[PDB]
Amino acid sequence: SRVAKAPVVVPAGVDVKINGQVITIKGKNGELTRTLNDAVEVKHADNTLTFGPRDGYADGWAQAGTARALLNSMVIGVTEGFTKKLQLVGVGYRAAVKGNVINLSLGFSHPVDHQLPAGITAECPTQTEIVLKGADKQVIGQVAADLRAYRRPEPYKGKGVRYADEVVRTKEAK
Amino acid sequence: MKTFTAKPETVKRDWYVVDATGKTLGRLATELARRLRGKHKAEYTPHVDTGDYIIVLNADKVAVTGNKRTDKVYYHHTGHIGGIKQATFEEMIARRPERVIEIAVKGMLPKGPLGRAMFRKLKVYAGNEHNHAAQQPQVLDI
Amino acid sequence: MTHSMRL
Amino acid sequence: MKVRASVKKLCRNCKIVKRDGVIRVICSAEPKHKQRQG
Amino acid sequence: MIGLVGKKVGMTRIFTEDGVSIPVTVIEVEANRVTQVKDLANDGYRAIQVTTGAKKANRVTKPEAGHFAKAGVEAGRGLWEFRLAEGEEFTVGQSISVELFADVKKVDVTGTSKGKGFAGTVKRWNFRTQDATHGNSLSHRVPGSIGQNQTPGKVFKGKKMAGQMGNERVTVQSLDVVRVDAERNLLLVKGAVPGATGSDLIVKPAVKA
RNA sequence: CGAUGUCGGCUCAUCACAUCCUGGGGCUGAAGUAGGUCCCAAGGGUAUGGCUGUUCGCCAUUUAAAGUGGUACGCGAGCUG
RNA sequence: UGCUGAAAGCAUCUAAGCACGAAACUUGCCCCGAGAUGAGUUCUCCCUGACCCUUUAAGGGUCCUGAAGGAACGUUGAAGA
Numbered sequence: 001s002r003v004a005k006a007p008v009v010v011p012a013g014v015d016v017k018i019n020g021q022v023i024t025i026k027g028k029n030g031e032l033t034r035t036l037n038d039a040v041e042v043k044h045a046d047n048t049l050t051f052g053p054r055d056g057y058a059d060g061w062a063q064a065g066t067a068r069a070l071l072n073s074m075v076i077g078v079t080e081g082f083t084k085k086l087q088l089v090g091v092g093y094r095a096a097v098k099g100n101v102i103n104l105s106l107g108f109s110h111p112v113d114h115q116l117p118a119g120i121t122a123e124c125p126t127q128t129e130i131v132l133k134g135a136d137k138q139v140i141g142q143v144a145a146d147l148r149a150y151r152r153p154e155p156y157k158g159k160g161v162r163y164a165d166e167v168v169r170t171k172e173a174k
Numbered sequence: 175m176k177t178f179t180a181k182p183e184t185v186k187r188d189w190y191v192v193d194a195t196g197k198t199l200g201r202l203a204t205e206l207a208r209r210l211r212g213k214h215k216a217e218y219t220p221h222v223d224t225g226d227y228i229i230v231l232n233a234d235k236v237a238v239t240g241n242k243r244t245d246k247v248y249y250h251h252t253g254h255i256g257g258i259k260q261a262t263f264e265e266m267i268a269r270r271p272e273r274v275i276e277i278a279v280k281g282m283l284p285k286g287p288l289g290r291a292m293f294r295k296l297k298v299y300a301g302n303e304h305n306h307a308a309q310q311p312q313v314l315d316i
Numbered sequence: 317m318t319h320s321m322r323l
Numbered sequence: 324m325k326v327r328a329s330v331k332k333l334c335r336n337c338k339i340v341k342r343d344g345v346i347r348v349i350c351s352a353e354p355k356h357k358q359r360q361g
Numbered sequence: 362m363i364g365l366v367g368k369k370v371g372m373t374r375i376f377t378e379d380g381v382s383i384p385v386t387v388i389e390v391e392a393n394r395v396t397q398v399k400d401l402a403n404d405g406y407r408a409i410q411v412t413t414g415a416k417k418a419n420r421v422t423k424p425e426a427g428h429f430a431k432a433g434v435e436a437g438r439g440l441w442e443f444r445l446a447e448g449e450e451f452t453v454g455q456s457i458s459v460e461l462f463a464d465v466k467k468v469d470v471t472g473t474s475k476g477k478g479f480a481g482t483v484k485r486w487n488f489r490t491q492d493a494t495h496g497n498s499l500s501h502r503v504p505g506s507i508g509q510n511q512t513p514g515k516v517f518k519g520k521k522m523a524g525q526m527g528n529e530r531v532t533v534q535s536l537d538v539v540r541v542d543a544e545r546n547l548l549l550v551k552g553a554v555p556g557a558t559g560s561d562l563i564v565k566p567a568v569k570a
Numbered sequence: 571c572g573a574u575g576u577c578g579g580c581u582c583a584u585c586a587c588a589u590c591c592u593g594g595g596g597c598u599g600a601a602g603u604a605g606g607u608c609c610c611a612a613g614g615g616u617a618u619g620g621c622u623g624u625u626c627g628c629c630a631u632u633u634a635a636a637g638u639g640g641u642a643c644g645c646g647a648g649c650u651g
Numbered sequence: 652u653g654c655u656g657a658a659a660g661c662a663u664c665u666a667a668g669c670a671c672g673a674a675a676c677u678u679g680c681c682c683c684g685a686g687a688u689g690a691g692u693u694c695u696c697c698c699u700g701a702c703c704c705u706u707u708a709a710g711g712g713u714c715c716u717g718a719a720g721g722a723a724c725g726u727u728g729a730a731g732a
């Protein structure tokens with residue numbers, strides 16, 4: 001509603017082509033597409049797409065706001081792209097990167113091999129610092145969630161894979 | 175006088191082909207059972223099979239409203255130690271698509287030998303094609 | 317002999 | 324967590340959500356106030 | 362890959378030079394000639410059909426005579442099929458000897474087990490014999506109780522009772538091959554395979570790897 | 571009431587789940603080890619003896635564990651008595 | 652347990668969408684199984700004669716031929732009441 005009644009300013013190499021209910025976008029970083037819901041209406045007046053509720057359906061405004069939000073961060077990803085920073089707190093934890101397959105050494109007994117999607121690239125400046133660079137926000141967020149879910153943060157030492165400036169509350173060991 | 179009765183040698187049966195794509199399950203099944211018993215013909219007889227042969231194409235694409243695609247459970251019992259087997263609508267559509275249509279129609283038919291014969295009239299396929307092209311199946315839309 | 321009997 | 328028939332706001336930061344058709348209470352400030360089934 | 366059909370020829374033991382003795386079953390694996398090849402054009406599934414051995418020319422009926430003389434092979438006893446798992450192509454009349462089992466390490470042997478006849482519940486289902494003394498009356502190796510009472514009111518299906526024991530198809534899995542003789546067309550496997558001596562065995566490579 | 575044979579033991583079971591073990595998780599006044607408590611889960615498993623007619627119980631010694639109930643307090647045209 | 656995400660400018664595992672997640676469920680292993688009357692498929696083999704009658708019918712009868720195969724019999728079997 002308040003989200004959906006605000007059009008999205010689409011900048012710099014827009015390529016926002018429509019096919020029925022499908023939105024395809026080429027951009028600076030790449031190309032992202034999605035099939036939208038059937039209760040939403042998109043329109044390409046005034047250089048910038050506007051979202052209305054389609055007739056007949058009950059849930060119009062929430063679907064339209066969800067559509068506006070996903071297309072907004074989607075076209076933001078095709079403009080400049082999303083990044084995610086993970087760090088490894090804890091001794092014996094190294095995170096060397098081999099191309100498209102991250103090889104974590106979280107010290108279970110064996111290495112951890114992690115195949116990436118076709119989109120997100122990964123870089124390590126130091127050995128406790130993974131930086132994911134990808135356009136599609138859900139895929140980089142999902143792969144950061146998988147990499148954290150290999151080994152969670154510990155509430156006693158702070159040991160584990162964690163997000164960058166996310167604060168972990170460590171209870172002291174009684 | 176006596177009322178008219180049909181005779182099983184002179185009843186003249188038609189062939190129909192029904193595309194079951196994108197339709198509701200039980201509405202289609204009710205129309206199928208009505209056509210199978212013969213209640214659409216004027217010379218209806220309750221002990222003579224009057225109905226027609228129906229070829230139901232595309233049993234894969236049948237639809238169910240609500241959350242029945244994941245939660246309509248089919249129960250059947252193997253007649254054994256304590257094995258009550260069960261399968262939802264999704265794995266029944268994937269594993270054995272024609273069984274959904276045949277179960278829905280067989281629940282709607284009379285029980286007895288006449289109902290089993292009028293169920294043998296029904297021929298359910300999951301593809302778009304059938305091998306019954308030698309009987310000229312007319313399109314029965316519903 | 318009261319073994320089968322309900323006594 | 325606490326599976327209960329009565330879920331209430333124990334804390335200032337716990338919000339009441341309805342996930343998967345069940346009523347749950349999430350406190351982001353402490354995990355002892357997490358509860359279910361209300 | 363496919364299995365081969367052989368014959369159970371006794372049991373012996375071989376002595377490894379380390380000192381260990383291992384019991385082997387010797388399987389005479391004769392030349393298996395492929396009679397008919399199934400493919401998914403006509404049949405819907407792909408397979409091969411093999412035969413082995415020999416039969417009397419007067420003991421062969423004209424149906425199986427014509428079926429053998431259709432494609433290149435000679436009369437053996439029995440016909441068997443093998444299911445060709447993804448990537449084998451065999452011409453009819455192709456002799457298949459025991460070199461594929463010279464490569465392999467574990468094996469599955471399928472045979473018809475020895476028929477123990479009408480057996481009781483003690484022999485068939487390892488039931489516990491009741492008391493031999495302390496009062497017992499005509500009920501030493503009887504099966505006990507077979508059901509509860511009025512509430513089921515019936516015996517359950519699959520209740521273990523007496524009946525035919527033996528004489529059925531049994532597969533034994535993961536038997537180690539210890540030696541393959543190609544000039545004798547023999548196969549030594551470790552352990553015991555189902556059947557009497559001289560019974561026909563089916564030898565497939567192991568699936569539970 | 572012109573008859574529906576009891577308690578216990580033996581033999582054979584079968585189901586429920588309100589789970590004893592195994593398996594999966596949340597919280598912990600959870601450092602680890604080991605627990606407590608709650609949620610999911612019924613595939614498989616789930617002692618031997620002494621005493622007692624005993625079920626039960628106590629006890630000795632194990633076990634991963636020594637589940638709780640229904641089935642005419644399952645089961646005598648199957649046995650015992 | 653999550654990711655993205657509004658409804659509800661925030662927040663939110665959820666309404667749209669996406670991913671994980673157990674000895675339970677469906678497969679994978681093994682055995683039975685086309686009486687699966689919805690009685691399936693594949694290959695091979697065997698039959699290539701004349702006439703009359705009547706309610707000229709998916710009809711009866713007569714002579715001549717009995718084919719593949721089967722059964723019977725016998726010797727029997729680590730098969731079997």
Ligand SMILES: CC[C@H]1OC(=O)[C@H](C)[C@@H](O[C@H]2C[C@@](C)(OC)[C@@H](O)[C@H](C)O2)[C@H](C)[C@@H](O[C@@H]2O[C@H](C)C[C@H](N(C)C)[C@H]2O)[C@](C)(O)C[C@@H](C)C(=O)[C@H](C)[C@@H](O)[C@]1(C)O
Pocket residue numbers: 317318319320321322573575
């Ligand atoms: C030789 C064979 C004899 O039977 C037995 O010895 C058995 C072993 C008795 O049990 C003997 C021994 C014993 C201990 O039961 C085993 C004892 O309790 C009874 C009273 O007598 C029987 C069966 C008794 O029945 C029982 O009578 C009970 C009153 C009720 C019971 N019913 C509820 C189920 C019923 O079956 C009873 C009365 O003798 C049956 C009547 C018909 C007879 O007299 C007949 C002629 C018998 O003598 C007999 C068949 O020749």
